[PDB]
Amino acid sequence: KGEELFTGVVPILIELDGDVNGHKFFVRGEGEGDATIGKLSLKFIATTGKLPVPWPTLVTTLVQAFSRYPDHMKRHFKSAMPEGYVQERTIYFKDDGTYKTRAEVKFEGCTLVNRIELKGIDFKEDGNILGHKLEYNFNSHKVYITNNGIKANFTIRHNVEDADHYQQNTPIGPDDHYLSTQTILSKDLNEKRDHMVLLEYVTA
Amino acid sequence: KGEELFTGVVPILIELDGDVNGHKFFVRGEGEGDATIGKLSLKFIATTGKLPVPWPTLVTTLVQAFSRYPDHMKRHFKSAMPEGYVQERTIYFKDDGTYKTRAEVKFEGCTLVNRIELKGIDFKEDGNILGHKLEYNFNSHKVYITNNGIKANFTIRHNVEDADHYQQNTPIGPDDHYLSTQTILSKDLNEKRDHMVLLEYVTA
């Protein structure tokens, strides 16, 4: 009943409550995922105003279960559904502050929900994060698999006008392989709130 | 938990097993419904070969819960979800054979399913149904509401190259009003099997 929950389009809800160097903010996203196609379409909004941090830095934190596993890899995220999984990460931004995140990803009724908590500390003022000198775009990366859970490691590349991820996933109630990601960030021209429109393609 | 199951796009499965004048056939459909928009998008296929009857005659039988209730009419199909409802009909085709149908419409996991049984008797040979002289199109109609269930009556107009519905709906586990329907039938050019592509718009 794992994979068989993803054979088509699934609604997504993402909620993150965060705090970076004392700056509290909350983000809510709604969209859809198509695991057969490794597709995500989502819109995120800052419900607390202007985001004190760059949108790209929250991309990795905000539903890997929608990844396209090749058909010979089905056996190697979906396996943990519908009960879901806990996804924890430690994110270190070079010469800048660290993110510690804990999220719970599971089905809540017929909706896949990602309920998330994020804490940022030791970020420098005027730095790439708080001075908002980071570009609104996203590069392509590879996510490496391996306590009855998955473990993950990768480094995100943020275009600066001029981040090491450490991940642990554990089931709420898998051999080595990896996932390839490509992302596109955009804006809703008709949106007055701080937001992020995202499209994502991931395969293993 | 009725209406709150339809605030977005819901997957649909339709299965009909039927028998008209001894001609057995089965039809399976898959698609999506958007109740907020009174929209249905579906593809039906005859899994038993060529349909012995015209596709338009099965349209009314094959998810009214996807109808667009105006926001002042919410209180007046969705109310019976997720447990679902039984939908029964008697269909009389003038100077031609009658359909008696029984269907069960309910959620099966996260999918809205319409499991249906259909029996046809007293149809004339060479007639509008069995001689396949009926056009592949569909007119617009109005569905009238009124035993803890809904009751319904209407007459479908089939373009002939040259049908009174009697309905009863009962909950598995509402004041007078009506619904307006508009339908479009098409074909998948890349489909070798007997099929029907349908798009539907319904409001109350």
Side-chain angles (χ1 to χ4, degrees), chain A residues 1-141 143-204, chain B residues 1-141 143-204:
Chain A
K1 179 62 173 171
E3 289 170 357
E4 307 292 312
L5 296 172
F6 291 86
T7 73
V9 63
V10 174
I12 305 172
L13 171 62
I14 307 179
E15 292 201 349
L16 174 162
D17 181 67
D19 178 317
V20 298
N21 278 50
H23 306 69
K24 290 183 180 291
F25 65 91
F26 176 99
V27 168
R28 177 191 281 114
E30 301 182 346
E32 273 174 5
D34 180 355
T36 84
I37 317 297
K39 176 187 180 178
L40 293 171
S41 157
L42 294 162
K43 178 180 174 182
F44 300 98
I45 293 172
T47 64
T48 47
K50 287 194 192 70
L51 197 66
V53 147
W55 277 106
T57 66
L58 302 182
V59 169
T60 58
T61 292
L62 295 148
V63 287
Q64 285 183 314
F66 284 107
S67 303
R68 176 186 180 191
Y69 274 124
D71 208 298
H72 66 284
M73 284 180 170
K74 297 248 187 178
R75 286 281 185 273
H76 297 286
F77 309 102
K78 294 184 187 60
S79 60
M81 298 298 159
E83 291 90 350
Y85 55 79
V86 175
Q87 176 162 301
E88 296 220 19
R89 291 210 185 96
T90 299
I91 302 174
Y92 302 92
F93 298 29
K94 266 180 181 181
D95 59 75
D96 220 322
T98 303
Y99 283 169
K100 275 180 179 192
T101 74
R102 180 182 186 283
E104 282 181 28
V105 183
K106 70 188 234 172
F107 274 93
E108 297 197 6
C110 280
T111 300
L112 186 142
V113 181
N114 180 23
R115 296 209 186 277
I116 294 169
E117 279 177 335
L118 175 158
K119 185 60 183 280
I121 58 178
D122 306 335
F123 283 89
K124 308 190 182 185
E125 331 155 309
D126 207 34
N128 292 326
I129 289 73
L130 291 181
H132 289 140
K133 307 184 181 185
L134 238 56
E135 306 192 20
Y136 191 68
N137 48 42
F138 218 77
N139 291 304
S140 52
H141 307 87
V143 173
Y144 300 100
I145 295 100
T146 59
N147 187 29
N148 185 229
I150 298 129
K151 286 188 176 183
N153 190 214
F154 55 101
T155 307
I156 293 297
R157 287 166 174 209
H158 290 257
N159 284 335
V160 188
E161 180 278 301
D162 66 353
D164 293 76
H165 284 58
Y166 295 91
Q167 180 182 327
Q168 294 135 65
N169 294 64
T170 166
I172 281 175
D175 193 329
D176 198 331
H177 66 282
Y178 63 89
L179 298 161
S180 177
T181 312
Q182 301 192 75
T183 287
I184 281 207
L185 311 187
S186 62
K187 297 289 184 183
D188 182 322
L189 300 195
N190 304 305
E191 236 305 321
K192 329 165 136 187
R193 294 169 296 183
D194 205 343
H195 69 294
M196 170 174 73
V197 176
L198 174 60
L199 177 63
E200 188 158 296
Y201 276 104
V202 188
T203 298
Chain B
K1 179 62 173 171
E3 289 170 357
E4 307 292 312
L5 296 172
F6 291 86
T7 73
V9 63
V10 174
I12 305 172
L13 171 62
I14 307 179
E15 292 201 349
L16 174 162
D17 181 67
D19 178 317
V20 298
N21 278 50
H23 306 69
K24 290 183 180 291
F25 65 91
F26 176 99
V27 168
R28 177 191 281 114
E30 301 182 346
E32 273 174 5
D34 180 355
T36 84
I37 317 297
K39 176 187 180 178
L40 293 171
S41 157
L42 294 162
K43 178 180 174 182
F44 300 98
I45 293 172
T47 64
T48 47
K50 287 194 192 70
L51 197 66
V53 147
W55 277 106
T57 66
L58 302 182
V59 169
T60 58
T61 292
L62 295 148
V63 287
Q64 285 183 314
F66 284 107
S67 303
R68 176 186 180 191
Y69 274 124
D71 208 298
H72 66 284
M73 284 180 170
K74 297 248 187 178
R75 286 281 185 273
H76 297 286
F77 309 102
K78 294 184 187 60
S79 60
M81 298 298 159
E83 291 90 350
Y85 55 79
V86 175
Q87 176 162 301
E88 296 220 19
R89 291 210 185 96
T90 299
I91 302 174
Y92 302 92
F93 298 29
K94 266 180 181 181
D95 59 75
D96 220 322
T98 303
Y99 283 169
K100 275 180 179 192
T101 74
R102 180 182 186 283
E104 282 181 28
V105 183
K106 70 188 234 172
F107 274 93
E108 297 197 6
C110 280
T111 300
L112 186 142
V113 181
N114 180 23
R115 296 209 186 277
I116 294 169
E117 279 177 335
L118 175 158
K119 185 60 183 280
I121 58 178
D122 306 335
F123 283 89
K124 308 190 182 185
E125 331 155 309
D126 207 34
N128 292 326
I129 289 73
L130 291 181
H132 289 140
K133 307 184 181 185
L134 238 56
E135 306 192 20
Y136 191 68
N137 48 42
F138 218 77
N139 291 304
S140 52
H141 307 87
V143 173
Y144 300 100
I145 295 100
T146 59
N147 187 29
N148 185 229
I150 298 129
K151 286 188 176 183
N153 190 214
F154 55 101
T155 307
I156 293 297
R157 287 166 174 209
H158 290 257
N159 284 335
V160 188
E161 180 278 301
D162 66 353
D164 293 76
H165 284 58
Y166 295 91
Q167 180 182 327
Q168 294 135 65
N169 294 64
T170 166
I172 281 175
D175 193 329
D176 198 331
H177 66 282
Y178 63 89
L179 298 161
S180 177
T181 312
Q182 301 192 75
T183 287
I184 281 207
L185 311 187
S186 62
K187 297 289 184 183
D188 182 322
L189 300 195
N190 304 305
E191 236 305 321
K192 329 165 136 187
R193 294 169 296 183
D194 205 343
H195 69 294
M196 170 174 73
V197 176
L198 174 60
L199 177 63
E200 188 158 296
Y201 276 104
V202 188
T203 298

